[PDB]
Design a binder for this molecule. Structure first.
Ligand SMILES: Nc1nc2c(ncn2[C@@H]2O[C@H](COP(=O)(O)OP(=O)(O)OP(=O)(O)O)[C@@H](O)[C@H]2O)c(=O)[nH]1
Ligand SMILES: Nc1nc2c(ncn2[C@@H]2O[C@H](COP(=O)(O)OP(=O)(O)O)[C@@H](O)[C@H]2O)c(=O)[nH]1
Ligand SMILES: [Mg+2]
Lengths: 427, 415
């Protein structure tokens, strides 16, 4: 039996993890105290009294976010030793969270992770949650990955990174941190699932009819998506049964491990009067650009692989009919060096939503993970913002004066340049 | 997480007292230090500026004139500060920078440093210092800058912030003003991370023209200074995501190590969201007496306070950024950051604050240069300085570095 350990880094990582683990508790039936009146052990551990303890490590350099959990509704679900915290944060600076401030707490975090890992028997790998635009979620995440690759070299290290957006941005140096962490994590990670904040913001404004979405709504939708992704690893499915299967199915080459994720349908709570959507409608909505999580134009790019994961009242023959209908569209172009064919895994467990949330319960849902070249369009948007700034050396001193060499700004950028070429040669 | 507040000189004390009074009225603390508010939002992050024991400010009071003790103690909030933190000397400096930097400042600086250490060492996690003073005096302008030098030599990793005010001819018209202003800017350039360039010219212009007060006293200017301090500190006082601590603010607003001089602005000066957004960027509300349309903003922070539609705030921000896109730099993407707070200030049901790192601030640094040159060619009163141990090479270096800062601002203006 194989199990997985979650690592949550920074404010964004911890806040996404709160919603995620809350939703896992509702899905499996675990009470907030850990009492549950199978494969769910992939994310939980059993004690003598029967209390289910998540394999979740919450890491932050500022106590404000973690102390929201140490006294929140789920304050009794996590052991206090799993919720690691420091007094000094990175202050939206990759160098602070990487070389000086994160170096103070990396040994403690690694010791805690080793403690959780020793309690496991067949460990697969780690699912690291973080953000690109933050000092902690970009510096300490990359430092932790570099540390884990020496110890847990054989364990897969997936990512759930939050792509910055101007509408909710907290710092102006977000592209700096996005490029810098991407350079130092591109080798150690093996399948990174990126989510763009502006896509979630647009979906919340359009579908959920929220005039000014807050982190609560975005976190709830992202928790829904992450649960839909990991339901294959939690409910003993027939596809993506392990972490290595994710690399096998979605990452043909080591440097292109950036799948694109789509989730359908997104329905406001007040719109429950609607008739339930058929398999064909949600399958078609998978390919629309109104339901994407990283806004781009996949119709231009070339698909490498595509895994579709259904949930709810879903019939296999209807899925096959939807596949046959979809495979006859000229906008779906596959790379000739990869076999042209979808992968479909169907889960019969109904989707679960948080009561009192803005997402109405649906009879069926679909999550589509496709490796496509068009996602590089989201990379260029970063690099431009990088090139507009490093050209004048703006905010560079904030990084060099805190223990990092200036020559790493260019190298990192150069790496992503090759990354961009990696998508131009393949496509 | 906590900020140690220092205030030096007559102007420093007379603006800091108003600052503490206004933020105490906002938080709910009365003159006795006891909380008498109605919301927990007021005390969510009150430990930033207060110590619990009753809530006591972290203020360290410094002067070379003993009378300013009583002038602060006779105030409505004079009895809430720690009586041990009043470090006021006997022999005043007057209006000479060298006296406050080499002879009289260097004698009290040891005791002030010990008091600052005693106040700072109690912090669980000190985040930085702030220091309210004047660039036109002898006690503030010299002794505060010497204090900053000592603190940075003692606390290199802590953010150091100031709320300096520069003199104006219509306010004091003293002949030795540009010497003190230039020599103080020469020290704030090298040993400071954040500075809010408050101008007495702007305050006098606002009080005379817009407010129609025929003879604006120091109280009228100090009211505007207190409003400015409250507006620029409401982010650090109440919970939020923008400018959480001093270092995040510095990283957000300071592109280059020396370009850290800021342009405050407040609205309304004593009415809906679009009117606030139009007035907030307007030149009549600036506290540095420069036209923001002369140069180009490097970074902008807009903080709104009160009960407003945040959707309307965002739409107005985008509309202004589109209409005034000719005045924002294209090489700093997304340089205008908007924050909203639900606690309005004292006496205003709706308010707006603007903090702008802009190149037009060099205009002010031109004035202090010009007024310097007009009395440096003839060596008007330099013998008042060399008699205190100063040297004229320091004057030349100060002028040269201020001119170099002006040149850097102009380079990044037309870049
Ligand atoms: N969707 C969503 N995005 C978030 C959330 N929290 C933070 N972010 C995004 O993350 C960016 C900043 O990165 P953070 O991870 O919050 O930075 P941090 O972890 O606090 O580390 P520091 O930079 O040192 O403060 C912001 O621009 C937000 O857009 C969240 O709860 N939900
Ligand atoms: N706006 C304002 N400016 C002041 C005030 N007091 C002094 N100033 C300015 O500060 C200068 C005098 O410096 P001062 O602080 O009195 O010298 P010091 O106390 O010895 O450091 C004058 O040019 C004034 O313009 C005040 O209450 N409000
Ligand atoms: Mg944080």
């Amino acid at each position: 039996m194989r199990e997985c350990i979650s690592i949550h880094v920074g404010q964004a990582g911890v806040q996404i993890g709160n919603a995620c683990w809350e939703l896992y508790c509702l899905e499996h039936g675990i009470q907030p105290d850990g009492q549950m009146p199978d494969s769910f052990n992939t994310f939980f551990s059993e004690t003598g009294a029967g209390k289910h303890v998540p394999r979740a490590v919450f890491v932050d350099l500022e106590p404000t976010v973690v102390d929201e959990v140490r006294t929140g509704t789920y304050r009794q679900l996590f052991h206090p030793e799993q919720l690691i915290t420091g007094k000094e944060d990175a202050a939206n600076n990759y160098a602070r969270g990487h070389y000086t401030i994160g170096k103070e707490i990396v040994d403690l975090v690694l010791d805690r992770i080793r403690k959780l890992a020793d309690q496991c028997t067949g460990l697969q790998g780690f699912l690291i949650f973080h953000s690109f635009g933050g000092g902690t979620g970009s510096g300490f995440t990359s430092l932790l990955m570099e540390r884990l690759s020496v110890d847990y070299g054989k364990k897969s290290k997936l990512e759930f990174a939050i792509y910055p957006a101007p509408q909710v941005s907290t710092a102006v140096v977000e592209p700096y941190n996005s490029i810098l962490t991407t350079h130092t994590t591109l080798e150690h990670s093996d399948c990174a699932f990126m989510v763009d904040n502006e896509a979630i913001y647009d979906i919340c404004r359009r579908n959920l009819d929220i005039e000014r979405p807050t982190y609560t709504n975005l976190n709830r939708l992202i928790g829904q998506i992450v649960s839909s992704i990991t339901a294959s690893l939690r409910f003993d499915g027939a596809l993506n049964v392990d972490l290595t299967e994710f690399q096998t199915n979605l990452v043909p080459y080591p440097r292109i491990h950036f799948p694109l994720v789509t989730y359908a349908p997104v329905i406001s709570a007040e719109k429950a009067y609607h008739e339930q959507l058929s398999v064909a409608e949600i399958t078609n909505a998978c390919f629309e650009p109104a339901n994407q999580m990283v806004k781009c134009d996949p119709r231009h790019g070339k698909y490498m692989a595509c895994c579709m994961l259904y949930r709810g009242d879903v019939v296999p023959k209807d899925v096959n009919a939807a596949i046959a209908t979809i495979k006859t569209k000229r906008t779906i172009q596959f790379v000739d060096w990869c076999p042209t064919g979808f992968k479909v895994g169907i889960n019969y467990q109904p989707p679960t939503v948080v009561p009192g949330g803005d997402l109405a319960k649906v009879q069926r849902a679909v999550c589509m993970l496709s490796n496509t070249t068009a996602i590089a369009e989201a990379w260029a948007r970063l690099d431009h913002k990088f090139d507009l700034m490093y050209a004048k050396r703006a905010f560079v001193h904030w990084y060099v004066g805190e223990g990092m060499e200036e020559g790493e700004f260019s190298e990192a950028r150069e790496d992503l340049a090759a990354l961009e070429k990696d998508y131009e040669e393949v496509g | 997480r906590e900020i140690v507040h220092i205030q030096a000189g007559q102007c420093g004390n007379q603006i800091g007292a108003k600052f503490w009074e206004i933020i105490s009225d906002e938080h709910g603390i009365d003159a006795t230090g006891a909380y008498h508010g109605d919301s927990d939002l007021q005390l969510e992050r009150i430990n930033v500026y207060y110590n619990e024991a009753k809530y006591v400010p972290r203020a360290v009071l410094v002067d070379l004139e003993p009378g300013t003790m009583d002038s602060v103690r006779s105030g409505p909030f004079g009895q809430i500060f720690r009586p041990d933190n009043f470090v006021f000397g006997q022999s005043g400096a007057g209006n000479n920078w060298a006296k406050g930097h080499y002879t009289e400042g260097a004698e009290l600086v040891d005791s002030v440093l010990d008091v600052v250490r005693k106040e700072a060492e109690s912090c669980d996690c000190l985040q930085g210092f702030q220091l309210t003073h004047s660039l036109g005096g002898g006690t503030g302008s010299g002794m505060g800058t010497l204090l900053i030098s000592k603190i940075r030599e003692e606390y290199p990793d802590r953010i150091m912030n100031t709320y300096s005010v520069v003199p104006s001819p219509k306010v004091s018209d003293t002949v030795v003003e540009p010497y003190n202003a230039t020599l103080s800017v020469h020290q704030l350039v090298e040993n400071t991370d954040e500075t809010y360039c408050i101008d007495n010219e702007a305050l006098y212009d606002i009080c005379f023209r817009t407010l129609k007060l025929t003879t604006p006293t120091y109280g009228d200017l100090n009211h505007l200074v207190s409003l400015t301090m409250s507006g620029v500190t409401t982010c650090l006082r109440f919970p939020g995501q923008l400018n959480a601590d001093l270092r995040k603010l510095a990283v957000n607003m300071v592109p280059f190590p020396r370009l850290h001089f800021f342009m405050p602005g407040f609205a309304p000066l004593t009415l809906t969201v679009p009117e606030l957004t139009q007035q907030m960027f307007d030149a009549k509300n600036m506290m540095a007496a420069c036209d923001p349309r002369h140069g180009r903003y490097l970074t902008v922070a807009a903080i709104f306070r009160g009960r407003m539609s945040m959707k309307e705030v965002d739409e107005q921000m985008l509309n202004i950024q589109n209409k005034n896109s000719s005045y924002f730099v294209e090489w700093i993407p997304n340089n205008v950051k908007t924050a909203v707070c639900d606690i309005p200030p004292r006496g205003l049901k709706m308010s707006a604050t603007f903090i702008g790192n802009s190149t037009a601030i060099q205009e002010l640094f031109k004035r202090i240069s010009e007024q310097f040159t007009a009395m440096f060619r003839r060596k008007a009163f330099l013998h008042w300085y060399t008699g205190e141990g100063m040297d004229e090479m320091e004057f030349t270096e100060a002028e040269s570095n201020m001119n170099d800062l002006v040149s850097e601002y102009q380079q990044y203006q037309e870049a």
